[PDB]
């Protein structure tokens, strides 16, 4: 069972699907960023949630979505 | 009592200690030097050096207490103060230019003046001497009348004829009535001063 199993696999996960859909839609409207984002997400999902982790997540999402 | 008789009560007043040594009189200097030798009790939970501390409101809250529930009693007190403040602001906004100089919005002044308007100066002492019971007038001490004002206010606000009106709203209305020399508490003071006026002749039985 996934809940018993002790890992959030970023691969084939909801986070991966959501970011892929977002990036495809941005390309239609018109990497290291994805690596940073998935690192932040996996840290938040597996380790403890603190303000530093939330800020890292924020910065990664901003860089991926072209928000400054 | 877990305190020895040696222990003296603490003096929380914060400006008393800041008094310059020059202003101290020899008696006051002696008292201050004496206090060094004495043992002092731990200051109780309650009174603080806070500039917003008000002993009268603290006593009123303690008298509304039921079963040691101080949180709820203080909640009711702060709600009453807020309600009085809001009603005064509402009456201040709707008042004419000249009537806005005679509207007091400070709820603490209203509370103090309302309690002062309910203090009786003369009361009675139940005394049976000749086999039949006799009321006799007496002068009430200041503590006794201060207590009676609060007790009458609380008993009036705990009346059952007020169905489902919450205590902060009842108490704010009674306080605003007594601020203007109106209401049943002022009538209770008057029916005591009159019914002790009807019994001046018994005053020789003191």
């Amino acid at each position: 069972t996934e809940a018993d199993m002790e890992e959030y696999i970023w691969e084939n996960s909801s986070s991966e699907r959501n970011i892929l859909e977002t990036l495809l839609q941005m390309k239609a409207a018109e990497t290291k960023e994805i690596e940073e984002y998935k690192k932040s997400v996996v840290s938040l999902k597996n380790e403890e949630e603190n303000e530093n982790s939330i800020s890292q997540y924020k910065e990664s999402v901003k860089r991926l979505l072209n928000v400054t | 009592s877990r305190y020895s008789p040696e222990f003296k009560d603490p003096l929380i007043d914060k400006e008393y200690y800041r008094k310059p040594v020059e202003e101290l009189t020899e008696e006051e200097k002696y008292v201050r030097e004496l206090k060094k030798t004495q043992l002092i009790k731990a200051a109780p939970a309650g009174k603080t050096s806070s500039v917003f501390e008000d002993p009268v409101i603290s006593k009123f809250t303690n008298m509304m207490m039921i079963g040691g529930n101080k949180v709820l009693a203080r909640s009711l007190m702060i709600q009453t103060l807020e309600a009085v403040k809001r009603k005064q602001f509402e009456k201040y906004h709707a008042a004419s230019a000249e009537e806005q100089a005679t509207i007091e919005r400070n709820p603490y002044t209203i509370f103090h003046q309302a309690l002062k308007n309910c203090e009786p100066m003369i009361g009675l002492v139940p005394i049976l001497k000749g086999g039949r019971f006799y009321q006799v007038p007496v002068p009430l001490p200041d503590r006794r009348r201060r207590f009676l004002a609060m007790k009458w206010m609380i008993t009036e606000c705990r009346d059952k004829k007020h169905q489902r009106t919450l205590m902060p709203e009842k108490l704010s209305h009674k306080l605003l009535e007594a601020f203007h020399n109106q209401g049943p508490v002022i009538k209770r003071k008057h029916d005591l001063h009159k019914m002790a006026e009807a019994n001046r002749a018994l005053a020789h039985y003191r």
Binding site: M26, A29, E51, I54, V61, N66 | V51, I78, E82, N106
Partner: protein
């Protein structure tokens, strides 16, 4: 008046206005916010005879983001989070007021926690017998949604025939207001009438007819638990409610031409500890996954400038009547007892 700013247009606030109060007109108050403002801020508005909001860094950052928003990209989810009573609801209201002045379509949910608890009249949806309706909660929202967006209800026109009953149906091309009216008149079709509205707004905004703002306060309620029960005393999940199921579709970034703004809230939350305030702790795994990816924005306590400005505003309204409150010692005591928390400071100033 050092605590007030003459600039009452939210589109022109900047970092120099940080800590100053700007005024919301009565017309803007009645149109933009029939339901938005906190219950204890309505009291301040009624007693001071004016609604003045401070300009803070959370709202300024979230306005800088919404000014530079690409309407071709999918809608970006923003999430305001912070400790209790730190002002995130009023930051959300600041943003809603900014967006309403630029002729955005406002979809404002004042408190999503009210849809998952203390509901008497639950019905089984004739549209789908597996979900439940909340006519009183839906018809209450519909009237105020109509009030906020009266202008657009005739410009926006449906694109499908909706069958309320065999006798009554809304024909294609009718103005959206009709649907809203059908929800306001007959409460039986209130919950069906909310979803249709959402279905239109999420669609037509993509076409480019208008910009849509989805402002949901207490967004953490959608992926939590409910205190609602069946007639067999069994629990009901949040997804079983049509009102909550139709609002989750609006949180997905499968549309463009707008922005989705939300604010967490532990106040009124179900099955959460008092000190839980971070996004995952309130949202849950499901909530975080649903909102992921999203931009979190922190709302903190007053810094010294904001605290001093709030106390100067209260003194300028003569709301601090204690003779010691204006003095510096009174201000230090206020600062310590509230620790610069806006809600605690307001509550303590209420009875001074």
């Amino acid at each position: 008046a050092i605590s007030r700013t003459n600039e009452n247009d939210p589109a022109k606030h900047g970092d120099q206005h940080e800590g100053q109060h700007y005024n919301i007109s009565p017309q803007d108050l009645e149109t933009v916010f029939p339901h938005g403002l906190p219950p204890r801020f309505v009291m301040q508005v009624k007693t001071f005879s004016e609604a003045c909001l401070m300009v803070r860094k959370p709202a300024l950052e979230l306005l800088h983001y919404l000014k530079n928003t690409s309407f071709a990209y999918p809608a970006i989810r923003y999430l305001l989070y912070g400790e209790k009573g730190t002002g995130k609801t009023l930051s959300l209201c600041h943003v809603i007021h900014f967006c309403a002045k630029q002729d955005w379509l406002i979809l404002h949910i004042p408190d999503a926690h009210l849809w998952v608890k203390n509901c008497r009249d639950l019905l089984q949806s004739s549209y789908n017998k597996q979900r439940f309706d909340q006519p009183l909660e839906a018809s209450t929202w519909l009237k105020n949604f109509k009030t906020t967006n009266e202008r657009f209800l005739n410009q926006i026109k449906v694109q499908e025939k909706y069958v309320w009953n065999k006798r009554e149906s809304t024909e294609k091309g009718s103005p959206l207001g009709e649907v809203v009216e059908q929800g306001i008149t007959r409460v039986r079709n209130a919950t069906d009438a909310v979803g249709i509205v959402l279905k239109e707004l999420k669609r037509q905004s993509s076409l480019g007819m208008f910009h849509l703002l989805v402002a949901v306060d207490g967004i953490n309620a959608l992926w939590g638990r409910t205190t609602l029960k069946r007639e067999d005393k069994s629990p009901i999940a949040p997804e079983e409610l049509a009102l909550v199921h139709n609002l989750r579709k609006m949180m997905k970034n499968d549309w463009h031409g707008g922005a989705i703004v939300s604010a967490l809230s532990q106040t009124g939350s179900l099955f959460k500890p008092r000190k839980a305030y971070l996004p995952q702790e309130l949202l849950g795994k499901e909530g975080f996954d649903a909102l992921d990816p999203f931009i979190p924005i922190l709302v903190s306590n007053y810094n010294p400038k904001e605290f001093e400005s709030c106390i100067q505003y209260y003194l300028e309204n003569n709301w601090l009547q204690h003779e010691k409150a204006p003095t510096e010692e009174g201000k230090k005591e206020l600062l310590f007892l509230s620790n610069a928390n806006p809600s605690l400071l307001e509550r303590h100033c209420a009875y001074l």
